[PDB]
Design a protein around this ligand. Structure first.
Ligand code: NAD
Ligand code: NAD
Ligand code: NAD
Ligand code: NAD
Ligand code: TCL
Ligand code: TCL
Ligand code: TCL
Ligand code: TCL
Lengths: 256, 256, 256, 256
């Protein structure tokens, strides 16, 4: 409501209306924050601008940011500095892997396919954290989105699971680095949600019914449940929480 | 100020101003919640009553509830059902072990001691949950406090460590049971905090100092940081969070 | 092979020819070990003495030992000390919980059933390790059997899951106490196996069918696979392994 | 003495007498296995050939295999195929990261340093498995060596910790892919041992003294304890174990 009043956050990864990052943006805005959006490339610019503009308030800054490109990533955060000077956090909702690796056997993943997944889905957290460390002059929280596949084997998640494991270990090492700089680093492990990228995981419809049937809360997750947990982590209420991975998956993670 | 407005919660475990339960009480109260307190035996009625009255708004119910007593436990929740219509959660901050067993080697723990710690520090959660369920129509969240010692070996924690491990598994199984009924069950794993029961844990000062020197946030936690994470878990913001264990310990849990 | 020549181990838990403890006995025997068997009640002395005799040229010591009875427990190892003097390990394969509690919801577990399960399935490892220590003057290993349900929520496991969590934490703390005396403590988390006690777990056939179809090895575990892993753990090949939990479940534990 | 008789294993990562892979080689040899060795580059050809010759009996195949190079990888395994035909396993003991990244803040790791560690220390396992799979027509085990730094934050391990988390997740996805082909994939999480590349880790003597004082067994690990646990994983005694990470660290991993 006013939980994030006066704070400005950088949300990375909105692609369209179903993006979990969009769910995060709406929750942060409703909690009173100001936002900055970064999108992967020119193709997405229109979607993010129009989405950003549905939010009441000042025209939000929308900037291209291919996290695979160091010069653009660095220039993006320099622009952010010149524009607002200080931000209070970054929501990192980025991941990618060649579609053909998310099927069949993980053992057939090509080297380039594996490094690509690692580069975009795990390293980008660290590269982003490094630039955000510069503008988060008042400390704050850095968030990332992970998935159960990084902790245990999920069918067809393959190289993405290995990349998330690496992302989750990154959260821990970054939390270890940044805490003394007043910066908390956390992850949200969301349960399956229908998004543009969900199309790369096989038989999604049946995965969702499995969640509805077996998850403790008997229902699938929503972008809003994730965004609201994100509000907590970016807010002062989470002051003592860092290097933590919170599962917003209707409790599915406890099932053996 | 309004996050918990219109909600009523039971805070079990207040012994004095330093109790973690009290920090939770204050946080819930500052978030607009109505509180009902439960104390162990008569010796603690005066203390709790006093602290409760120090809050404002309508006076708070203060009921005796010794978790080793099934009758007094069922009576307490009977009173609550009659006095208040519904509650939206319970904050379980109860634990006990004989100081004798918290010294030296765990292999020397008596069957009596081991069963006593299990009964009070772990089973109580379930006992409380079965009663809470009766007055928790509309749903809500059940919270309990645990410690790292239930996940790994912490010097001197011994039998309490094994108790917390049960508590922690109990959280998972209860979450699995109660989710269909709209009830979430989560735990907060707090870092060392200076409390009455902190005397059983030998050489606390060295403990607080190692945390300040090695924890990512370079500070020990407080009853308020825990209180604030509880506000989150009892709120609708934590809608899809259940069967989780959130470490409010300055990030110490990630260290190896 | 001949890994255990001249070593003597106590196998507690044989009840059946299908008992996992018996699978361990046979493997220990084939690796050249001398065994001492203990059985719950007179009701089982017949089967154990009978099975124990089927081993080639052997002393075949078989003593009674109800782990809930401190007198018997103490007399059993006193007898062992008098007749053998020094043993090199103990296989703790004991567990129990009222069948009622293995049904329906965990929240309805009664206080006595919960403590019954903890006393028999978890504390006994400690009570046994305490006596065993007196007779393991050359170091050695203490093994116990746990199951996945102690780490994550497995349906129809309820109170056993929580007793197993205490058991697994007990392993860690005992390992921590005993390592300095040259004594290692480890667990084997076995996958579902048709034993007498497995009849207490609902719809076992489908449980086995699921392991067969989804476990990495596409087959269910056998008492022999567990036995052979016990051989490694009691042998010197595992002298650097303590406080560990080895899943002998065709890799099922890794599945998310 | 003949646990691995008739079996042939490929050991990757011998650099010198103090390498953990050399400890594994002696252990596998003592148990009767035949060995094929691979070295990183010309520089090590000598050292490895000399150590191999020491394993009297049969002139062991010693081949170059830079895991960074696709052709060498293919060349090495096609040679084993044409030369030996069938192997029963591979011991993967390879890791690398720039020294500068193993100090200071992990957040400062460069994209290249990060992808380099991932490539050599994590992907290499998969590339090796893809090739080994072609010559393990009879099944068998693939082993890798990880470290606590991949599960939890270990000071200065930084990027290697993230690489190891990635390696550990890979062990699981590979176990899940190769199990149906009769191939098990496992890891040994070795405790700190004085090796050639251990010089890259912070004050090693104080690290070792810490383990000697805190570790359950009150002693540091050796290449032999690792080698003996490797013997088990490659033997038929471990046929039911896959996707597992056995800690051969004197029990240190259990400490909180
Ligand atoms: N949808 C789910 O069920 C689910 C569950 C758990 C975790 N996640 C994670 O949440 C995040 C967001 O995923 P989503 O499900 O909303 O899908 P999405 O397709 O909406 O978002 C993925 C985002 O990554 C961006 N991206 C890819 N390469 C990029 C690059 N090189 N530079 C900058 N951005 C790049 C895409 O533009 C997109 O905005 C991902 O990390 C994903 O793994 C999703
Ligand atoms: N203080 C810390 O450092 C710390 C850290 C992590 C977790 N915890 C946990 O938080 C909870 C609260 O502990 P605390 O540190 O505030 O100590 P505390 O001594 O203030 O509170 C413990 C409470 O348990 C109550 N209790 C004991 N036996 C009871 C019984 N039979 N019936 C009902 N209530 C009973 C006591 O009255 C007391 O109010 C405990 O579970 C504890 O293990 C504490
Ligand atoms: N069968 C499986 O699928 C499976 C899987 C994982 C773990 N386990 C564990 O392995 C152990 C052996 O179980 P099992 O499956 O061979 O079944 P089982 O029924 O053959 O053996 C259980 C043993 O516990 C003994 N026991 C019960 N109460 C006792 C008491 N008061 N004092 C002494 N002994 C007592 C019984 O006599 C019996 O010998 C148990 O801890 C069990 O939880 C079994
Ligand atoms: N020494 C320890 O305390 C310890 C603890 C836990 C895990 N480990 C792991 O054990 C493995 C062996 O390490 P070690 O301690 O024996 O050190 P080491 O220096 O003897 O071995 C490291 C090996 O990696 C090889 N290597 C590097 N780049 C390579 C490449 N491109 N292609 C092929 N091989 C390459 C090196 O030649 C060397 O043989 C590593 O994975 C290491 O992380 C070591
Ligand atoms: O991580 C995810 C988990 C689930 Cl269940 C669904 C979608 C996910 O997100 C992705 C999956 C594959 C690729 Cl290539 C990119 C992204 Cl963002
Ligand atoms: O769990 C705790 C953890 C820490 Cl570090 C300090 C105090 C704790 O709380 C207790 C410790 C011992 C007993 Cl007998 C009862 C309680 Cl409530
Ligand atoms: O732990 C077990 C796990 C599985 Cl899958 C099957 C049997 C098991 O063993 C038991 C189950 C229930 C009770 Cl009451 C006692 C025992 Cl020994
Ligand atoms: O993983 C390790 C863990 C420890 Cl305690 C000691 C040495 C280790 O091994 C390495 C460390 C750094 C680099 Cl660059 C390469 C290797 Cl093989």
């Amino acid at each position: 409501m006013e939980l994030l009043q006066g704070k400005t956050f950088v949300v990375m990864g909105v692609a369209n209306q179903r993006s979990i990052a969009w769910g995060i943006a709406r929750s942060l805005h409703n909690a009173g924050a100001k936002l900055i959006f970064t999108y992967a490339g020119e193709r997405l610019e229109r979607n993010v601008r129009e989405l950003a503009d549905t939010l009441e308030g000042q025209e939000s800054l929308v900037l291209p940011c291919d996290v695979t490109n160091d010069e653009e990533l660095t220039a993006c955060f320099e622009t952010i500095k010149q524009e607002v000077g200080t931000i209070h956090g970054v929501a990192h909702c980025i991941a990618f892997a060649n579609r053909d690796d998310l099927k069949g056997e993980f053992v057939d993943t090509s080297r380039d396919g594996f490094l690509l997944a690692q580069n975009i889905s795990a390293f980008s957290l660290t590269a982003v954290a490094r630039e955000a460390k510069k503008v988060m002059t008042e400390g704050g929280n850095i968030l990332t989105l992970t998935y159960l596949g990084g902790e245990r084997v999920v069918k067809n998640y393959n190289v993405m699971g290995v990349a998330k494991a690496s992302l989750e270990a990154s959260v821990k090492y970054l939390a270890n680095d940044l805490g003394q700089h007043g910066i908390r680093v956390n992850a949200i492990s969301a349960g399956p949600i229908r998004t543009l990228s969900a199309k790369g995981v096989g038989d999604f419809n049946s995965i969702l019914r499995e969640i509805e049937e077996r998850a403790p809360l008997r229902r699938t997750t929503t972008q809003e449940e994730v965004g609201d947990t994100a509000v907590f982590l970016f807010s002062d209420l989470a002051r003592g929480v860092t290097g933590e991975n919170i599962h917003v998956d209707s409790g599915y993670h406890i099932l053996g």
